């Protein structure tokens, strides 16, 4: 059949479910949308199903499918994400908010029929109940970042890191250091990549027809770092 990159040549429906626990506050979110790796384009709509989100939406953009990055033709031998499909991969993360708590994430990105599913479990701790996160002091926006990928030799996967800049209502900036591990689920061979990065851009929107607390996320991601 089709396997690996063959499965991303067109539009692919996406499903995102997440269970969270931040400083005891407990919530769930569901998301739907689609991704097109031909353009590196990603579109998702998220809804807090347990009422309302105890944290700011922008902090969970990262946690909410890098298999939809547009890996230009001359780099296709470094697309670890697509190479692990359809079986899938695990995505573990630890996010450090400077002078504030931290997120711990574990997720499974894999195909389940006709849909790419990213199911996550998040746990936050050590946050300041008056700080920028739990104080809902974050501007509802997102900037552009470089995601740095590196082959994890000890495992059979990759190590990834980057720093997010969440803008603050007072005009300052809160840095969120990201440290990320990916390892495949199947036993089939994957692509271990040379050092490279993904150019990420994100824009958060709002559906005016939407009554619940929600986020509309659009993402453009293109890989870079090698020379022909």
């Amino acid at each position: 059949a089709s396997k690996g990159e063959e499965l991303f040549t067109g539009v692919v429906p996406i499903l995102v479910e997440l269970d969270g626990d931040v400083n005891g506050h407990k919530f769930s979110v569901s998301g739907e949308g689609e991704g097109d790796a031909t353009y590196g384009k990603l579109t998702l709509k998220f809804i807090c199903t347990t009422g309302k989100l105890p944290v700011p939406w922008p902090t969970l953009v990262t946690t909410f499918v890098q298999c939809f990055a547009r890996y230009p033709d001359h780099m296709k031998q470094h697309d670890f994400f697509k190479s692990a499909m359809p079986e899938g991969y695990v995505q573990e993360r630890t996010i450090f908010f400077k002078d504030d708590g931290n997120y711990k994430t574990r997720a499974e990105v894999k195909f389940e029929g006709d849909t790419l599913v990213n199911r996550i479990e998040l746990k936050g701790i050590d946050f300041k109940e008056d700080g920028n996160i739990l104080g809902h002091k974050l501007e509802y926006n997102y900037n552009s970042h470089n995601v740095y990928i590196m082959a994890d030799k000890q495992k059979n996967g990759i190590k990834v890191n980057f720093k997010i800049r969440h803008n603050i209502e007072d005009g300052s900036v809160h840095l969120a250091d990201h440290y990320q591990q990916n390892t495949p689920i199947g036993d089939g061979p994957v692509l271990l990549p040379d050092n490279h990065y993904l150019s990420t851009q994100s824009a958060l929107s709002k559906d005016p027809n939407e009554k619940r607390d929600h986020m509309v996320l659009l993402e453009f991601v293109t890989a870079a770092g090698i020379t022909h």
Partner: nanobody
Framework: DVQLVESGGGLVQPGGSLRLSCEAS????????MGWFRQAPGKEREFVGAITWTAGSTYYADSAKGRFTISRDNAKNTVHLQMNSLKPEDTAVYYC????????????????????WGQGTQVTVSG
């Protein structure tokens, strides 16, 4: 490692009903689909039914549609196969099977598809 514990087989007079149950415990990865197979002594493994964990769409064998009813429990990593209008030739050992990898396409019914197998549970129909 991971283990699948079957339960709820048994002995029933024809026309009756029996409920097999299987619970996946442990394991590094989350369930994607669960199925039931059956084999009689000196005969060949048969697919009975299955269910996708996220979508919840059921798939039955020809000999089972209408009579058998497969379902989940609160996504509690537990699956149930309710059999109604049982019969003598339905006698066999019933195996629960689990698929934790991802897949693209329809749920397939071949044993290789399923990674993790239970030890089997005895279902006997007699007068």
């Amino acid at each position: 490692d991971v283990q699948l514990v079957e339960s709820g087989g048994g002995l029933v007079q024809p026309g009756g009903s029996l409920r097999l149950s299987c619970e996946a415990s442990g394991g590094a990865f989350s369930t994607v689909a669960m199925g039931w197979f059956r084999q009689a002594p000196g005969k060949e493994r048969e697919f009975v039914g299955a269910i996708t964990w996220t979508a919840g769409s059921t798939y039955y064998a020809d000999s089972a549609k209408g009579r058998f009813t497969i379902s989940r429990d609160n996504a509690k990593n537990t699956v149930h196969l309710q059999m109604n209008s049982l019969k003598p030739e339905d006698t066999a050992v019933y195996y629960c099977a689990q698929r934790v990898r991802g897949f693209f396409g329809p749920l397939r019914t071949t044993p290789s598809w399923y990674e993790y197998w239970g030890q089997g549970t005895q279902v006997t129909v007699s007068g």
